Design a protein around this ligand. Structure first.
Ligand SMILES: *C(=O)[C@@H](C(C)C)[C@@H](O)C(=O)N[C@H](C(=O)N[C@H](C(=O)O)[C@@H](C)CC)C(C)C
Ligand SMILES: *C(=O)[C@@H](C(C)C)[C@@H](O)C(=O)N[C@H](C(=O)N[C@H](C(=O)O)[C@@H](C)CC)C(C)C
Ligand SMILES: *C(=O)[C@@H](C(C)C)[C@@H](O)C(=O)N[C@H](C(=O)N[C@H](C(=O)O)[C@@H](C)CC)C(C)C
Ligand SMILES: *C(=O)[C@@H](C(C)C)[C@@H](O)C(=O)N[C@H](C(=O)N[C@H](C(=O)O)[C@@H](C)CC)C(C)C
Ligand SMILES: *C(=O)[C@@H](C(C)C)[C@@H](O)C(=O)N[C@H](C(=O)N[C@H](C(=O)O)[C@@H](C)CC)C(C)C
Ligand SMILES: *C(=O)[C@@H](C(C)C)[C@@H](O)C(=O)N[C@H](C(=O)N[C@H](C(=O)O)[C@@H](C)CC)C(C)C
Ligand SMILES: *C(=O)[C@@H](C(C)C)[C@@H](O)C(=O)N[C@H](C(=O)N[C@H](C(=O)O)[C@@H](C)CC)C(C)C
Ligand SMILES: *C(=O)[C@@H](C(C)C)[C@@H](O)C(=O)N[C@H](C(=O)N[C@H](C(=O)O)[C@@H](C)CC)C(C)C
Ligand SMILES: *C(=O)[C@@H](C(C)C)[C@@H](O)C(=O)N[C@H](C(=O)N[C@H](C(=O)O)[C@@H](C)CC)C(C)C
Lengths: 184, 182, 181, 182, 182, 183, 182, 182, 181
């Protein structure tokens, strides 16, 4: 991870331009860092746009929602830019960017899918874990429906299995607003 | 495992005795079912004696044994030694009415089943519905076998429930405490 | 396993016990027992007890084809659980002679597989799995009287059936209810 | 593995049946070669029946079996059940002409051989030349047994090639799909 | 490892980015961040991307590919050692006329790899994704080299090793970098 | 491993003076084969023994236990290569009674110099090295005597792994005939 | 690794690069970056590359080799301890007349190693690549030493250990640096 | 490792002290050679002090340090604390003549080198000849540095030979046992 | 923790060295370097070596021991917690009159341990080395404590646990440090 002297690491230097880089799985540690960067940038300037680059296979649903809620909470618009792949919770966070300011680069991939879970132990414990997983899937689908303009029924059907979208397909689906095509 | 001129279990099988002294898996269930079918083929009318010292195991393996007991013509006596827990207590209760026994210091434990579910939300709901339906099936049969309500079985099996031989008799899991004749 | 061993003694009465996963070893043993029983008497029924979570599809087809090849009717009796390839073999018993005990479970599901390596290798592996699922669904359709379309839908996810539901579905002919003493 | 009064395989060997239901290694080849020599010594005239359900294994173990089949006087019928893949399909095609069979749902898979080569450039060259010469030998024999050109065998074995019983017959790997006895 | 700034941060000051590893999401994140930083420092001056890589993640490679095409500065690519798999794809992604290899540097092109485990329906989806990804890789390589998609497909079936001079003849690079004048 | 009525399949073939080597050669395998040869000699000191060889080789000393026992006993020991006779396997194939060494047509033969290992003090490594070189000279001298090739040619041809067809093994002098199938 | 800068960073100030490890892509990426940095500081002044290495990756070796030949400054090579395998290749890569070994340093030359796993067709491609790479290594070593390719091939079949004096007589180095005061 | 900013070792390096308190591998040799070159560059006339507490390690790593000591102009004093064994004792004996010391309770151990050889007979011969030639080289230099005959060095190093500080002075491995300050 | 130095570096400024670990070549290399550094800073002022150690390498111990005796400055030793095995040896090595233990500190003396593997001739050499090293340890402990070599040999056959006051009575330390004020 290289140093820049004006001593910043490369990410800290980009943070100075209100750029946040998500290039990993989403766990509580990654969520904690991204939330902290969003709170920091809001404290520096409550009006100016933030840029969230997303190259992520996803991870913890609750970690994702910590980032999701922080984005909607803060005053600044958060632009989302997909490079490489936004899968699972990654695609959910891509769709969570400011309306009109969700992008993918032309060869970026987007993948949508129902969440996974686990339940072990007594029949009564499995019933509680199963009810929580079902309610969480309904929450994820209602929000994706609101963010994309697709019906709940279509989101449910389209996320039963792994669903791979091109950047153009993701724009058609309403997960992003535009494909950033080369301009220079 | 000593020899008689047969291994000790094979010798006891000649007296229509089957020994369950392990967890219940598909292998154990396959052995006990085969011994029950063998004994019925030898004599369809003489009693069989099933000794149970088991912490339980596979629910489906237990149902293979349970259905074989009810299917064959011979009465199957159940005799609890040591402990009959979980699926072991289910099978203890499944013996011929009036021929279900525990030795005086044998323990009986009843408890709700366990299960597992890993993968997609849709897979977890399917696994959860299956676990709920299987728990209802176990409780319904335990109710029929003990003369207790499903409501009471459900309440009493939420947590581990340890019974003495006398408590198991009062509950209707067995008919008699088998006290030393001498 | 008391000791003929208990299985060897039941084989004398034309009973085969399947109480494990189906791999090439288990298929080799069951095929050998079917061929032996046909050689002993080509007219008398064989009884195949099935308590199995399934296993290798091709190992399952080695048993399936030997059952349909031999002259004797092979009765199938589900105890405990017939899942995956176990339910397929339960459905493969002689017509009118497919049974489950009252508390036995039947589970149907699409096959599983694996593909590793170059795109071209993954394509070949995927086409083989797809074609094998079509073969399984065609035979299940023929054996149950259900349409291929209904079999495809009902095997997408784990599908658990009671003995009665398995009879209604056409995987078995009768639930074997205990005889009055 | 049940007993008859013989293990089930030994009982079938009495009827000149050899069961291949595993991967092919030196141990399995040693056993099958020994059964072939034993059956020839019992009767040099009567057919032998080789059931094949195998993913294959060692090429040289396969050739030990292949050369024993061609060496002995009795015809060896080959019967594919489940799957005859890799060296298994090679052995299926090696059965007596007119007496190579597959059951209707049995699968056949043909593929170029695999190998390994580690160490010095000069060692890798010797190993790579050996693998290429072994593939030419396999293709020459498959060509002779199927009636396909060496060019077609080379093309059709570059990738895994899965055949139905009917496709295996049309290819010349087997003579007949065995229909049920009634 | 050494300090002057660590050696890499000192080269970054002169708009040089060193790729000397496998490409994963972490490496892609670092190289994308360097590209964005160099653009922010000067949107008009060339960037130099040295490539010694066996490749790695296709999607991680595409993060770098798209960032190169997106930014205003020309990105020169310079192959030292080996550019294989996704490394060769990124070498070919350099600004037209500014893609280089050193004389003894190697280039390897090959179709992508993948895995899929689970239900038939999951494997079909995984298979279709890998096939579509390969068409995408082939389309871009065709555009970057001037070779037909049909030729790219044929030439990447197996591992294809090229000398620097072969890589230039193919259109993967523009020039073999000759030694500076002493 | 099936039964014949009661013998296991290998015990039944042993009754017909057939010994099956279908494994790596270690001290246990050598002990078995040497015991079978001594048994078969005690049964009949005149009738041929048939030693089938499908072996990747193994221990040089284990191989020499089998070699010396073959040459010690009165009966001729035929050798028949099926699958592969490599390393010490090819050595034992060549050690069969002259005129009675065979390979089936698709059987492979591989000849190669021995391998070894030496760890510890320089003085220990010198002793290990001298033993390995002297053992190679012993192997080379006997292969020369068994094939009719010169020691110089054996030395050169075994530097690297040398794969021979059944026909190439016959031409080399490692076997006498390729047993061809009868129609 | 003491401070003064760490000790290696202080020596880099005097245009000294210390190779004291195996050569992998990380080590090559570091040494190439150091050569580029030193050329940018001064394009005329000599660079000093101390080599104590058992070698490593051939392609990582060629990344360093090509960078040495590419840059304007002469790169002196000084062998201490051992320059083996790719280390000997890099020692021979130094500016003609400025390749040295200390009196007790060892040089070892040997053919490259490789690995090939999988289908016969993959093994053929891997073997052809290894053989072509050995021809490239031999051609350059011939140019560096003034020894024929036929002699290099013969002398590198097995591990070939040279004293400093033998390495000079071979043409791998120009001079043995003998102590001036001791 | 405390700070004084310098780490404790860096602070001692400022006074031309180098601390060897570990096994000798290529990394440790790289560091010690780098410190020796740095100290000569700082002042070519002032003594350097090398403290040795080492069980030894790599022979070639040891020769990298040995040859650097003989190459540089400064006298390198050697001071044994704790133990100088194997290559540590070799380096102790290689100090400036008259300036090789041990502390009174320090131990010196001399022993023949160890090695390994695996693979083909021809490979073992080459590895063996290399180990023998290396032992002759170590014995010759110890003979030159101690004034003992090569014959006596050979005999005295067959087995582990443990020396007191006073015995090491008597042997010629050191010049003086260092006497305490007042 | 940091002071504006890590805590150990801050104490080193006051001529305090902290040993709170096993003694290996790395720890000896660090402690010897600290002693040489403090002698060069001021050859007259006392050094303070805190010892809480189970011991470790005998030769690493002697690296420290010889450096303490070699340098001009007095090295005070202060036992806190436990000075066992080579730790007790180093505690005894402090300047006579400036060897201390805190009141609840423990001292343990014991013969050295070793290992020998391989040929009979190798085992004989290793056994002789261990015996001569025990004689060396006993001679120096005798010189440092005023106890006879024969008493030290007797008292160190087995683990011998000493309180701070028993350690003073033995001659391993000079004083038990009483609380200030
Ligand atoms: C994509 O990002 C998914 C996986 C990482 C592939 C992600 O959406 C997901 O399902 N994550 C799972 C998760 O957080 N599940 C929670 C949980 O068990 O806590 C459920 C409550 C969601 C219904 C991980 C794999 C457990
Ligand atoms: C007592 O025997 C129970 C455990 C061994 C403690 C036993 O009844 C049980 O719950 N076994 C579990 C089981 O078979 N569960 C099945 C299943 O997962 O298939 C559920 C369907 C039952 C609701 C074992 C531990 C999985
Ligand atoms: C039920 O028995 C299934 C699993 C054991 C749960 C069984 O039907 C199944 O799919 N088995 C898989 C199998 O044999 N797959 C083969 C294969 O990969 O070769 C496919 C060709 C089947 C379409 C096992 C789990 C791999
Ligand atoms: C099918 O049976 C193949 C594999 C088991 C899938 C089989 O034909 C095969 O290639 N086996 C390989 C083999 O025996 N290879 C030899 C060898 O390397 O010794 C080569 C010489 C073949 C040309 C096994 C998997 C190594
Ligand atoms: C060269 O760089 C290839 C390998 C690293 C050697 C690379 O191009 C490749 O195929 N990588 C594979 C990849 O990323 N595959 C993805 C995937 O399965 O997730 C496919 C979608 C691409 C068709 C990985 C590293 C398996
Ligand atoms: C072929 O059979 C060889 C190997 C199994 C590939 C075999 O000839 C061989 O070299 N075996 C080795 C052996 O026995 N080596 C002894 C030894 O080190 O004791 C040497 C004395 C032989 C010169 C095994 C692999 C060590
Ligand atoms: C000496 O440095 C050699 C080894 C480290 C002993 C080195 O020259 C060598 O052969 N390295 C090997 C290598 O890079 N091989 C490549 C490869 O397999 O990718 C060949 C293609 C080069 C002929 C390492 C050991 C793999
Ligand atoms: C003492 O320091 C010796 C060992 C550490 C005990 C040391 O001198 C030694 O022998 N080291 C060995 C070594 O470097 N051996 C080389 C080698 O195999 O490369 C020999 C060629 C030297 C004769 C290590 C332990 C391998
Ligand atoms: C107390 O510190 C002792 C043990 C750590 C408990 C310590 O004095 C000791 O005996 N250490 C041993 C040691 O250094 N032994 C050397 C050796 O084997 O090299 C002997 C020569 C000492 C006579 C360690 C535990 C090996």
């Amino acid at each position: 991870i290289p140093t820049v002297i004006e001593a910043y690491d490369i990410y800290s230097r980009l943070l100075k331009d209100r750029i946040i880089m998500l290039g990993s799985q989403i766990d509580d540690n990654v969520a904690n860092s991204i939330v902290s960067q969003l709170l920091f940038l809001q404290a520096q300037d409550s009006e100016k746009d933030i840029y969230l680059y997303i190259n992520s296979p996803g991870g913890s649903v609750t970690a994702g929602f910590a980032i999701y809620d922080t984005i909607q909470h803060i005053k600044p618009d958060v632009q989302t830019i997909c490079i490489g792949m936004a899968a699972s919770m990654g695609s959910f966070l891509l769709a969570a960017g400011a309306k009109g300011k969700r992008f993918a680069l032309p060869n970026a991939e987007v993948m949508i899918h129902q969440p996974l879970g686990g339940a072990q132990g007594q029949a009564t414990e499995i019933e509680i874990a199963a009810n929580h997983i079902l309610k969480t899937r309904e929450k994820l689908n209602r929000i994706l429906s609101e963010r994309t303009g697709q019906s709940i029924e279509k989101i449910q059907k389209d996320t039963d299995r792994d669903n791979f979208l091109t950047a153009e397909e993701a724009k058609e689906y309403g997960l992003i607003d535009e494909v950033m095509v080369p301009e220079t």
